[PDB]
Symmetry: C3
Subunit: 602 residues, 3 copies
């Protein structure tokens, strides 16, 4: 037989692509606009100041006056320990004696005791029966923050056992300087020692402030004069006080200066100042980004309006800070674009944003550093937000630039494809379309022709490319450039008609193409999945396409997907270590004391 059965390819099947109906003009869109990568983020330049809620307590000095009687303690004169001796109890210093102490740094020698009947008792030191004055001495060298002055060095006093205990001849006056503290509501204040006064330190006659102590014990004086410190004695400097309060609670008299709440307590404290900041406006919130702090603060778009008297105490301070910061760095290149705005970030931080306009060419640069010692991390969330914002911005910029470059490359490739289609329209148009078709250049546009398949049987190729005359004479000057192939159209039609092989398993009828024969020729034709070798315009061998190696024209993209990660929880200090880190434990102390007291039922 002078024919060879052809192979088969599942995506380049043997098809006849005659013009049939033709038409179906096509063209390449060379009119493509590529947009430069403009960032969609809206950013504004400026600086902002951050204020935090003040958690420090309000500390003020409190002076306490106490007068007490005590028998000689731990007496053991008689056989039965003289029944001991102890008066111990004391009473609050009277107001006039407090005035004497605050004026001349001395205290009276006599006290009055009121029995429930109403009788007034007169007690004297050593029974001298004199209402004279005694000086005060700084016992224990005034210690630290608890400077107390005393008039009696606690010596041995008069006593005598009548087989019992009966003695009280020791007058001592206790004057102590202490400091008190109060939380934010100021409903009460407590001394450092432990005494508690259930009332507002700013309470007055009609201020309406909280006060639970009995009113009759309270006493308010105006334009009072008192010595600053008792160490200096009666010659110490005296400062006028516009309003002072005297309270008699229990056995002690408490005195403190009544100040004004609005002018003495500020509930906002300056935390930090960011000289170079940016405001990123999202669809619902602002993002204040500080590269120096690596922090991003999120606040709602509605600016605040500071009106509370306890929150306007920072107005002058932050206005001066704004003026100084603007005068220092952004003096020339920028100008203050409108007034500042006050925002409340999530997490309750007061942020004062000041916009800046313009950009001059260059501006002064300043650097700073801090050596603060780490103790905790309460605001790591702003760092998390900053990390997300920075990574998102970088990724968006990189991918936008990549998209612009991709647009440019695609436009150039489209132009190149249009230029190439004028030479080999069929392959280019088939590749772009994605389906094997036939196209032909009809002037300046491509006129494709959808065409049908034929049956895969009876696909025979003549093993001679020579042109043979009608009289069975080979023409030595005419040789077919492509092998002659015979096909049976569809299987429903057993008729067989001869054609010529084209490209990518394509057949075409008509005048078979031919050219001058060449004595040396080793043409190879691809058909289906079997290469055919033609030497001297005749078939010699037929081998599978897989035998001839493949040029590695593909360019790989060495990118691997990111892997899942489980951030494991880390504990620097075990809770046992936190338990052992405190010298004093309230629960342990109370439990031990209660157990000892219960065992003390003897």
């Amino acid at each position: 037989d002078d024919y060879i059965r052809a192979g088969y390819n599942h995506k380049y099947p043997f098809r006849i692509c005659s013009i049939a109906k033709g038409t179906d003009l096509m063209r390449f869109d060379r009119d493509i606009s590529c947009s430069p990568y403009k960032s969609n983020a809206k950013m504004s330049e400026g600086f902002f100041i951050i204020y935090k809620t003040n958690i420090e307590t309000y500390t003020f000095p409190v002076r306490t006056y106490k007068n007490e009687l005590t028998f000689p303690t731990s007496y053991r004169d008689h056989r039965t320990t003289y029944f001991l001796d102890r008066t111990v109890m004391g009473l609050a210093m009277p107001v006039y004696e407090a005035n004497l102490v605050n004026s001349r740094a001395q205290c009276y020698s006599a006290v009055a005791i009121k029995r429930p009947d109403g009788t007034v008792f007169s007690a004297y030191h050593e029974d001298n029966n004199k209402n004279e004055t005694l000086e005060l001495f700084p016992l224990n060298f005034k210690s630290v923050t608890n400077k107390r002055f005393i008039t009696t060095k606690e010596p041995y006093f008069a006593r005598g056992p009548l087989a019992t205990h009966s003695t009280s001849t020791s007058l001592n006056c206790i004057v102590t300087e202490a400091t008190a503290k109060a939380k934010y509501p100021f409903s009460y204040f407590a001394l450092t020692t432990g005494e508690i006064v259930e009332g507002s330190p700013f309470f007055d006659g009609s201020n309406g402030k909280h006060f639970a102590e009995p009113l009759e014990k309270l006493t308010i004086l105006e334009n009072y004069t008192m010595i600053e410190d008792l160490m200096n004695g009666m010659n110490g400097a005296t400062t006028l006080v516009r309003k002072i309060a005297f309270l008699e609670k229990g056995d002690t008299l408490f005195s403190w200066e009544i100040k004004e709440e609005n002018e003495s307590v500020c509930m906002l404290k300056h935390w930090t100042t960011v000289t170079h900041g940016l405001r990123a406006e999202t669809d619902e919130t602002y993002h204040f980004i500080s590269k120096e702090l690596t922090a991003a603060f999120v606040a709602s778009k509605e600016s605040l309006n500071l009106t509370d008297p306890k929150q306007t105490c920072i107005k002058n301070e932050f206005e001066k800070i704004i003026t100084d910061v603007y005068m220092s760095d952004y003096n020339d290149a920028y100008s203050m674009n409108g007034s500042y705005q006050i925002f409340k970030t999530t997490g309750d931080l007061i942020l004062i944003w000041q916009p800046l306009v313009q950009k001059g060419s260059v501006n002064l640069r300043r650097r700073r550093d801090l050596v603060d010692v780490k103790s905790r991390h309460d605001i790591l969330y702003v760092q998390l937000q900053y990390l997300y914002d920075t990574l998102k911005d970088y990724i968006n910029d990189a991918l936008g630039n990549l998209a612009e470059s991709w647009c440019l490359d695609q436009k150039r490739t489209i132009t190149m494809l249009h230029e190439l289609s004028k030479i080999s329209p069929s392959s280019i148009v088939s590749e772009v379309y994605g389906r094997p078709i036939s196209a032909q250049l009809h002037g300046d546009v491509l006129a494709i022709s959808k065409c049908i398949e034929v049956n895969q049987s009876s696909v025979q190729l003549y093993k001679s490319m020579r042109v043979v005359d009608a009289k069975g004479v080979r023409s030595e000057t005419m040789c077919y450039n492509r092998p002659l192939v015979t096909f049976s159209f569809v299987n429903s039609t057993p008729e067989v008609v001869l054609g010529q092989l084209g490209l990518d398993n394509e057949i075409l009828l008509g005048d078979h193409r031919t050219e001058e024969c060449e004595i040396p020729s080793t043409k190879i034709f691809l058909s289906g999945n079997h290469a055919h070798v033609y030497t001297d315009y005749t078939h010699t061998n037929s081998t599978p396409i897989e035998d001839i190696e493949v040029l590695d024209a593909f360019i790989r993209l060495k990118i691997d997907p990111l892997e899942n990660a489980d951030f494991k929880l880390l504990d620097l200090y075990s809770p046992d270590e936190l338990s052992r880190a405190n010298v004093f434990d309230l629960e342990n102390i109370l439990r031990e004391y209660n157990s000892y007291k219960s065992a003390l039922y003897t």
Copy 2:
């Protein structure tokens, strides 16, 4: 001389590429499959509920009964302060008197005192010698959370100084309503005032619970009846108690209701409900992602099984929550795909995951918001995990889409290269191969030919492109399209043979190509690193290649690498500020009290 020495290029050297052996067929792989970008992550739809460990203490009401004798305090009748007067001490109220108080809101007028010998003492109010009853009054208007009822207003009592102190005629009954608290083990409970009972509040006759107090002091009653509040007096409503406990500790009697531990303490508390959640399954753990909370919870793949009686108290609650959530949002578009699963996330959070199936087309949408006030941040790790997961997902999606587009572009470029190789095979195949070679189209496949170099000396180009006859006659109708070049093969062979210049410093022997001459001609030929100008088919000038400018065909990728960042540590509040934020300091109070007591050695 009629010749010019050629230049040199280090990567396009003058080589002779005769066929020699030929062979070495090559082809382009146009059969490339481009996989679309399918995400490898496995995600499931549903909602989950998160439960946290309950840290709240167990609070229950405790009633205390106390009976005490006190002489008129701070007596000062006689000269020696009448040796004062103070009985002070007290004793626990007897059980029958407690019953009388709890029933008729009144207390007996007589008490019994047991001396160590065994004698029983009878003491009476005002020595009336009557065992009658007295009512209780809400002293201090019952205050807040410490409503205490008393029977004596502490008036002046009978006394008389025989130069000593001897008086005790004041019977007072103290009945107080207080609240106690206990940690999780319930080994003990302590009153708010400070009293401690070393026993389980759920202790019973044989429950086996921890109890350190002596058993003889304990007393357990059943079906006890008692008044709810003492403010209402004897007419107050009474509630039956199935089991009550009476404990006599020190000088006070404590009473509390014995409940059931399993039915009164729940160790898991509902935290939040996520209506729209996703479960990302990794190779070892599940990731529960909530976009609303911006949180990701990591739990092991093994579902739990709630069996502890103190942890099953949430079963009905969370089942009802599941039913309500499913009935509200996912009523129609989804159906409950199997039963729920319970997972324990890292960090000990109980997560109840409910799967959902299907997707109907649309579902109801609901929005919510919260105005909770920030105080701390204990679970920032879930936000960190969510941030990592979100960024990883976005990066993976973007790079997968980029890889798919790159595959498509590379496939089209390979097709274009195959089409181009049919016109200029040498350059295309050399570029793909990466090494300068020669190729020729042998029908439908390329037959490349590896070829060797020649010596770089004696590379001379004739300065005339005209074809000169054997008789020294220039042919005005035939002119060489390329300059004639002479080379000496390798330096080991000094013989010189004339050839014709090709492309990219390539030489070829044989019949030199020629065409019709043209009077106007300004052809320029590139050879080595020196362009040669040929006007009228003769050499005129020779200039370096760098003189002629270069088209900027390269398309840049404006991408810069990310920079290193050092997240600096931020401290909102200095540790000194934390120290100053507390009104009461245990260490300072104890140190001051101890110093004062040590100085009280008088």
Copy 3:
């Protein structure tokens, strides 16, 4: 009329591109070097150990000795409660009695009382007038951590009421074993019960340590011998102590062993060991990355030098750890490259970095896990830094690989463009240049020609492509391949001259191109914005270009920008829950006690 008005395109306008001046040689740069993506990060291999500051207090045993007298408590013999009976007060045990207790586990039966006058009182148990010894008993079964031994079981003592109170005949000796704690400065130590000693536990005769207690009360002994535990009695084992301290404070005597501060307190505690670590060196700091912990530690580039005696206590431990870790995993594949370095990371963590060199081929692999219970998260910042570093590294690697692939693709595209320009130079050079120009291949280089526009009026196309002889005879063998177009040059010159249409609205004069006529012909020519159809070399129709569809040659990049995210603040436990989580509240206890004491003014 035999002419049709042409259309117009705003970017491909009708221009005449005659050679004019020519020149302007151009070429393609095929000499492009691409770079394999080499990472710029500098990483070193090794392992490091992390040490944290020790927050645990220093606990040591303290023995207390107390001797007290107490009358029979709660006496009620006589009618007036026998005026009660209470001596109660006590005194510090003398040093010699302490020696007797510490040696023979027994205490003397007599004590001495010194009155302020100077007299010495002799008191005895039951008035036996014997200075004998008594044993100690472990009261309350020694409890836990408060083992106390007593000699008196607190029985009834001798007493008698003479209408008053007079009795003291109960000698009791209190010996207690307690534990004390101290913070870092060691300025003071406090017992667990609550007693405070204002002095350094390491104080000595001349150590210079802080000590506020009076020196005369202190007593230091050397080579002291004492029983370890009092439970064993007089037969208990005794351990020599090189130095012991006896302090008499108040009514109690305190004894503790004086150790050496340098050899007993270590201020650095081992936290974790990272067997596989990496050190990333930035421009200013090192980054120590541990994949196992998912943590990155940032430290300055200057290595420390441990010299403090209280910080060198870890030297041997961490050197042994280094040796063991190297011997275990990196025994063969790696060698210790130099000595270790000590860094102080931000956050005050001591990091001991050990470099490793080489890589052998494979090394042993070991895995570990921990089941620690979560209680807090203090070091989340290292996890944040690790997350940033990991994401930055991955993004940099991916984008570098993408850049390298882009370089390769661009180089191949440039080669392809150079090959294509030899066929259709005008379109390729115009696309690369970005502006419509004309180019022509002058041998091996392109000689472009900048050319000017012409007026958009009088652009007429002849509706016949047939070549007509000068005698008005159509040539059936010659037909123009392109339509003949007439233009009026610029509008300032109304003269009209006929030309031939080219490509992309280009005109050219000279000998109009022509070829053999074909009976079937349906050529379509694009001009301006109107396609023209030519059948049988004559015009038939003119339609807009938008009518013919467009091949979708563009390849999209399905990438969408990342969206802004607001990480909302999450609170696991409300501050009210933190308030309710404590059984004991110092503020509430103090307020209630103070209110009760104030109401106790009776």
